[PDB]
Ligand binder design. Structure first.
Ligand SMILES: */C=C\C(=O)N[C@H]1CCN(c2ccc(C(N)=O)c(Nc3ccc(C(=O)NC(C)(C)C)cc3)n2)C1
Length: 252
């Protein structure tokens, strides 16, 4: 086994989350993703997994290794007991305060600032691809994984992606703004009354999402800044983080 390879004999399966919760060597909690035959460009993914092993940030779901000697192959990651952020936001029982919503934004922004510092694009950032752990901390998952998939996220894409397929750091910025909108809307579908086709037209005509009721003006300004028509006029993740911290200090 190489350092990116986990022996599946070390796994104990505990329940279904295909994705399962289990233990590695009896003691360490893991999530186990079973990669369906024909769904993934597996040799390309394996090569990338070696790089992904070295990404490490507290707000990034950790990749522990892969099991590639049999099929289906397994992806072994940090266990996130409260599941996907989208579903979490939609549970009305939580009765979230806006400070909790702003902290979810900050968690993601810190992960994305880290990926940006490593010149790594997420390519599909959205609440459905963030996870929540047992302490309520949100982390970014599935970063980069769309490249190995053999349902396009129109509603999280900037004009230049829709028109020209121009992906960049600034397309991740645009997506982050839509994710803030998802958080502050408690998990509403962006452009909820429109189809994907209608959304692409709306965006290209220069129109945008509007302010969630739970977002203050200052929070709306931050998400809206991610949607500049000109990619180069959108902020970096480092700037977004500074903006979010400033609002946390002001709205405390
Ligand atoms: C909103 C999208 C979604 O439902 N995604 C599913 C596909 C991938 N999923 C996934 C991936 C990785 C993990 C992990 N690292 O732990 C998890 N974890 C997970 C999922 C669901 C639940 C759960 O259902 N919790 C409640 C409280 C019963 C709702 C817990 C942990 N999931 C999920």
């Amino acid at each position: 086994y190489g350092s990116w390879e986990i022996d599946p004999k070390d796994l104990t399966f505990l329940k279904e989350l295909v994705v399962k919760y289990g233990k590695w060597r009896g003691q360490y909690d893991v999530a186990i993703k079973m990669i369906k035959e024909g769904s993934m460009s597996e040799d390309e993914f394996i090569e990338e997994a070696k790089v992904m092993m070295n990404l490490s940030h507290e707000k990034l779901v950790q990749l522990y290794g892969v099991c590639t000697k049999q099929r289906p192959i397994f992806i072994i990651t940090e266990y996130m007991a409260n599941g996907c952020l989208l579903n979490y936001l939609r549970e009305m029982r939580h009765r979230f305060q806006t400070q909790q919503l702003l902290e979810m934004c900050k968690d993601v922004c810190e992960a994305m600032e880290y990926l940006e510092s490593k010149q790594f694009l997420h390519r599909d950032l959205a609440a459905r691809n963030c996870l929540v752990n047992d302490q309520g901390v949100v982390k970014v998952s599935d970063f980069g994984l769309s490249r190995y998939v053999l349902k396009f996220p129109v509603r999280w894409s900037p004009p230049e992606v829709l028109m020209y397929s121009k992906f960049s750091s600034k397309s991740d910025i645009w997506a982050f703004g839509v994710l803030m909108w998802e958080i502050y809307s408690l998990g509403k579908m962006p452009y909820e009354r429109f189809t994907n086709s209608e959304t692409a037209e709306h965006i290209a005509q220069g129109l945008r999402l509007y302010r969630p009721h739970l977002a203050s003006e200052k929070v709306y300004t931050i998400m809206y800044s991610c949607w500049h028509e000109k990619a180069d006029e959108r902020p970096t993740f480092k700037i977004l983080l500074s903006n979010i911290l400033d609002v946390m200090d002001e709205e405390s």
